[PDB]
Design a protein around this ligand. Structure first.
Ligand SMILES: Cc1cc(/C=C/C#N)cc(C)c1Nc1ccnc(Nc2ccc(C#N)cc2)n1
Ligand SMILES: Cc1c(CO)cnn1-c1ccc(F)cc1
Ligand SMILES: Cc1c(CO)cnn1-c1ccc(F)cc1
Ligand SMILES: [Mg+2]
Lengths: 415, 556
């Protein structure tokens, strides 16, 4: 009810980010949403003395027909002061990734109940463009904590902890973790029980609220089943020259991750200049080397540790037939997590939809495990990604990304 | 009197840390001073400026300029210094409407709102920064000191504040009259509708009555401007549009600057004249920017210029957008990285046209370029019409399918259909996924010395075929490609090739069909002639047979 003072970082001006082109249907949806938000006092029209801007668009959350305004506050979030005044931080709960069921709630509508510092509001400015720029873009700023801004969970955090106290005291084994506009709620209960507790939780916020348009939804995750991708070598009775070449290449690559990998005795099998399809019998020495390599590869990688002061990096490879592999790391060759997807939903003829869904699933895993989003290295041309990703986006946050333009040789080894 | 609503002032600040201008007034002749004093006396009577005391420490210089072929002087207050110190504003006019997104209108009327410009007050707290001084006759008295009460012409904030003030006034009229459109440009309002002319003129008088609620008068004697309108390089008519006349000069010899102007005209023309080309003319502007230098036109540029003159021989017009019909975009390959497109709704009636040029890069292919052109047209179409057109593309469905399923990147093109108008985009080669049984295996390598640039490239095969070639002025990377080329040249129609060159694999896995490197181009031409090629990579220096042998032959 009273505003928390908020500043940008020293020597740092507000965002001035161009609005990208919006479709007719997203413009109409935003006009309708913003007319209502303005009537409810959440946003107000601004004049030309405000030169700041952040892009806006609109999405449909997973499994619903109603539009959700999404403001891309990535630049504002970079430029906003860090929030360590009351707490140095919310030490990320390491138990969340061990629960059998984790449900994700959109609680962002709660933020609209807290006014935003009068002197900071100018920096939340956004524009609803018009088709063909035929009428001036509609200019607004926020009067209340916005969805998507990193300050909102921080400023609302004292109110959230109070709202949730009776639920936590009654359910002490439940892990509740807040990331931006999401609440993550993990339990080890039978899913029918689980769903009921989640509905219990919603009521605490409905009760306090007295409506949230997307609070009723539930994205269910089962992180205890999440799968990883160790390095595995083929088991064959007949090895061709080509097979052994590919094995030596994969082992050479692995030797940068794992020290004691040896290829000497496997190379020796190719002595001469042989046809690629010719079958080569493994000698005993080569078989032993190969078994010793198999054994090395069953052990964890040495010296792998998470540092919360460093970015997480996520790399993705397209493997074909709807399959995608990925790795998350901070230092080269020190993977914190690897994985593979194939269940790309409703995208069997659309690579770019499949990649957008992969980015979202990886980001979710990163939030659950470390409590922040990775920086993505995406195998796509920038112009293709930028034209299409917002058509498939269903999350209320947005990570950072860069583009890979040269084909990585390592795609072969994650196959 | 009739009460009028005031126009709300926009609060205005100087940039953080800056103070207002304190700029010396230049000396003026007795004649100019007399003229400025009369001009300013009238401006003061009209409320635009006010006399101020000597406490105000700011100043901006004032000038008198003789309006040519007239005995009447005009005043110029030079706000360049205040403008550097004034905050930035939101600029609404950055994106201008494209005529091809406009709707046909039966009537468009123009209303002059220049007098309204002066009803727009300047923020009271900012006025002091606009002070100026008329020098006195013979500098024997204090100069006359004035400041502005209204938005000054030439001040940084005037266009944005004027436009934002007028938009706010007009918003309720536009909302409660959805059967008209209103657009402001300079000191005019343009009002369009599809109404019978009597209702249209009724709307116009209602707009005039609405504007009177702020005391804004518009001239009774109706505007002289009437369709067609010359606007932002275009000619707008009620039911069609075009660009203003494109006139390519005749010239015996061309300068850098001339060629830049020529390309500018051709680029402007290309939004409605189909098929304009500028590659060979732009190639003449490579690197150099000595605006007076004469460049000989190549034979290729002469042909391009000649082809463009033909395209421009007679007027072409676009039609306006009908939101009830699909948008269709058709693309043609023109050669040399150039693509052209037309967007239409009814056959043979273009809304607009355009072109796309290949990005600068070492290697490329036609499928990638077509994809890029599709993404550019999509983005432009979202801007102009808010939706993606349906595409008509010169590439077979089966070719696209093969491309995107095997390409290492994610890629996508929205809803499209094949149009069989040559030249078609095709896949020139496609490497095997598995080694070929019965095909000879070539183990290739090359090496060079970084100092003498002397190198060797070669191969050995499982049939005992061998070749090593000594090379001069070469590099490790070049010799690795040179070795692959030799294997392609000396093999039959099916071949397995084993390389340790990560550089060469990176290039070939990008699937180029054209390259800035004549060596890559030679390799592409050999690949096109083969029936089957399998390319295998191995790590260097690991005792791998075949690779080890040829590495030794070429590094000797
Ligand atoms: C952008 C714009 C520039 C001018 C005028 C600029 C100037 N000078 C005049 C108008 C009215 C508009 N606004 C719109 C909006 C939607 N359809 C149209 N169609 C439209 C406009 C002019 C003519 C004509 N003749 C025909 C159709 N104009
Ligand atoms: C989504 C986006 C961004 C942000 O990545 C930049 N441009 N665009 C974009 C590109 C093409 C469009 F048609 C619409 C929007
Ligand atoms: C009319 C024309 C041409 C034809 O040569 C080239 N640029 N322009 C142009 C385009 C936009 C303008 F605002 C003014 C001029
Ligand atoms: Mg070598």
């Amino acid at each position: 009810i009273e505003t928390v003072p908020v500043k940008l970082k020293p020597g740092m001006d507000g965002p001035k980010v161009k609005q990208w082109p919006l479709t007719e249907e997203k413009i109409k949806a935003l006009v309708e949403i913003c007319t209502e938000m303005e009537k409810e006092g959440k946003i107000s029209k601004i004049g030309p003395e405000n030169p700041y801007n952040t892009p806006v668009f609109a999405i449909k959350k997973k499994d619903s027909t109603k539009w959700r305004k999404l403001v891309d506050f990535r630049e504002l979030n970079k430029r906003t002061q860090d929030f360590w005044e009351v707490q140095l931080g919310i030490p990320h709960p390491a138990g969340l990734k061990k629960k059998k069921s984790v449900t994700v709630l959109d609680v962002g509508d709660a933020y609209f109940s807290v006014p935003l510092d009068e002197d900071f509001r100018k920096y939340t400015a956004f524009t609803i463009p018009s088709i063909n720029n035929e009428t001036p873009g509609i200019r607004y700023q926020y009067n209340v904590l916005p969805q998507g801004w990193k300050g909102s969970p921080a400023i609302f955090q004292s109110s959230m902890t109070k709202i949730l106290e009776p639920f936590k005291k009654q359910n002490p084994d439940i892990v509740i973790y807040q990331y931006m506009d999401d609440l993550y709620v993990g339990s080890d209960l039978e899913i029918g029980q689980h769903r009921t507790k989640i509905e219990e939780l919603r009521q605490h916020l409905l009760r306090w609220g007295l409506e949230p348009p997307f609070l009723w939804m539930g994205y269910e995750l089962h992180p205890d089943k999440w799968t990883v991708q160790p390095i595995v070598l083929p088991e064959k009775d007949s090895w061709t020259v080509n097979d052994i070449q590919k094995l030596v290449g994969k082992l050479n690559w692995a030797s940068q991750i794992y020290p004691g990998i040896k290829v000497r005795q496997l190379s020796k099998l190719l002595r001469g200049t042989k046809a690629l399809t010719e079958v080569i019998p493994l000698t005993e020495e080569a078989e032993l080397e190969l078994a010793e390599n198999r054994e090395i590869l069953k052990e964890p990688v040495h010296g792998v540790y998470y540092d919360p002061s460093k970015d997480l990096i996520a790399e993705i490879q397209k493997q074909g037939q709807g399959q995608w592999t990925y790795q998350i790391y901070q230092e080269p060759f020190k993977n914190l997590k690897t994985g593979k997807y194939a269940r790309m939903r409703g995208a069997h003829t659309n690579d770019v939809k499949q990649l957008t869904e992969a980015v979202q699933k990886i980001t979710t895993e990163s939030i659950v495990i470390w409590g922040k989003t990775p920086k993505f290295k995406l195998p796509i041309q920038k112009e293709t990604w930028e034209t299409w990703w917002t058509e498939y986006w269903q999350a209320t946050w947005i990570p950072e990304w860069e583009f890979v333009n040269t084909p990585p040789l390592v795609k072969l080894w994650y196959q | 009197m009739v009460p009028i609503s005031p126009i709300e002032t926009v609060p205005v600040k100087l940039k953080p840390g800056m103070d207002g201008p304190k700029v010396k007034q230049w000396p003026l002749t007795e004649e100019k001073i007399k003229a400025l004093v009369e001009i300013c006396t009238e401006m003061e009577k009209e409320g635009k400026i006010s006399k101020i005391g000597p406490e105000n420490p700011y100043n901006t210089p004032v000038f008198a300029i003789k309006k040519k072929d007239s005995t009447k002087w005009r005043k110029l207050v030079d706000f360049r210094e205040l403008n550097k110190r004034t905050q930035d504003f939101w600029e609404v006019q950055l994106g201008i409407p494209h005529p091809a997104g406009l709707k046909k209108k039966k009537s468009v009327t123009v209303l002059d709102v220049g007098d309204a410009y002066f009803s727009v007050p300047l923020d009271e707290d900012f006025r002091k920064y606009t002070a100026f001084t008329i020098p006195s006759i013979n500098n024997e008295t204090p100069g006359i000191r004035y400041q502005y009460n209204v938005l000054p012409q030439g001040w940084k904030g005037s266009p944005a504040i004027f436009q934002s003030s007028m938009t706010k006034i007009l918003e309720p009229f536009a909302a409660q009259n959805p059967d008209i459109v209103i657009y402001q440009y300079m000191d005019d309002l343009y009002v369009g509708s599809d109404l019978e002319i009597g209702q249209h003129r009724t709307k116009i008088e209602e707009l005039r009555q609405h504007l009177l609620r702020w005391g804004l008068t518009t001239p009774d004697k109706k505007h002289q401007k009437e369709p067609p309108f010359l606007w932002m390089g275009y000619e707008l008519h009620p039911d069609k549009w075009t660009v203003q006349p494109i006139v390519l000069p005749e010239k015996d010899s061309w300068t850098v600057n001339d060629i830049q102007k020529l390309v500018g005209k051709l680029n402007w023309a290309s939004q409605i004249y189909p098929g304009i080309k500028v590659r060979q003319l732009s190639k003449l502007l490579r690197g150099t920017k000595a605006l007076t230098e004469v460049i000989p036109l190549t034979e290729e540029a002469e042909l391009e210029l000649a082809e463009n003159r033909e395209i421009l021989k007679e007027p072409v017009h676009g039609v306006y957008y009908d939101p009830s019909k699909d948008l269709i975009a058709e693309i043609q390959k023109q050669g040399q990285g150039q693509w052209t497109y037309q967007i239409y709704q009814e056959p043979f009636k273009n809304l607009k046209t355009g072109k796309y040029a290949r990005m600068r890069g070492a290697h490329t292919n036609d499928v990638k370029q077509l994809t890029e052109a599709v993404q550019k047209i999509t983005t432009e179409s979202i801007v102009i019409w808010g939706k993606t057109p349906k595409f008509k593309l010169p590439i077979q469905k089966e070719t696209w399918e093969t491309w995107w399923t095997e390409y290492w990147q994610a890629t996508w093109i929205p809803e499209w259909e094949f149009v069989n108008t040559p030249p078609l985009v095709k896949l020139w080669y496609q490497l095997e996924k598995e080694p070929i049984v019965g095909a000879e295996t070539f183990y290739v390598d090359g090496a060079a010395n970084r100092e003498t640039k002397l190198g060797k490239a070669g191969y050995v095969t499982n049939k005992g075929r061998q070749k090593v070639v000594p090379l001069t002025n070469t590099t490790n990377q070049k010799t690795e490609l040179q070795a692959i080329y030799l294997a392609l040249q000396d093999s039959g129609l099916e071949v397995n090739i084993v390389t340790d060159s990560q550089y060469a694999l990176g290039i070939i896995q990008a699937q180029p069909d054209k390259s800035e490197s004549e060596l890559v181009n030679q390799i592409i031409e050999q690949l096109i002639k083969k029936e089957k090629v399998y390319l295998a990579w191995v790590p260097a220096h690991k005792g791998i047979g075949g690779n080890e042998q040829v590495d030794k032959l070429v590094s000797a």
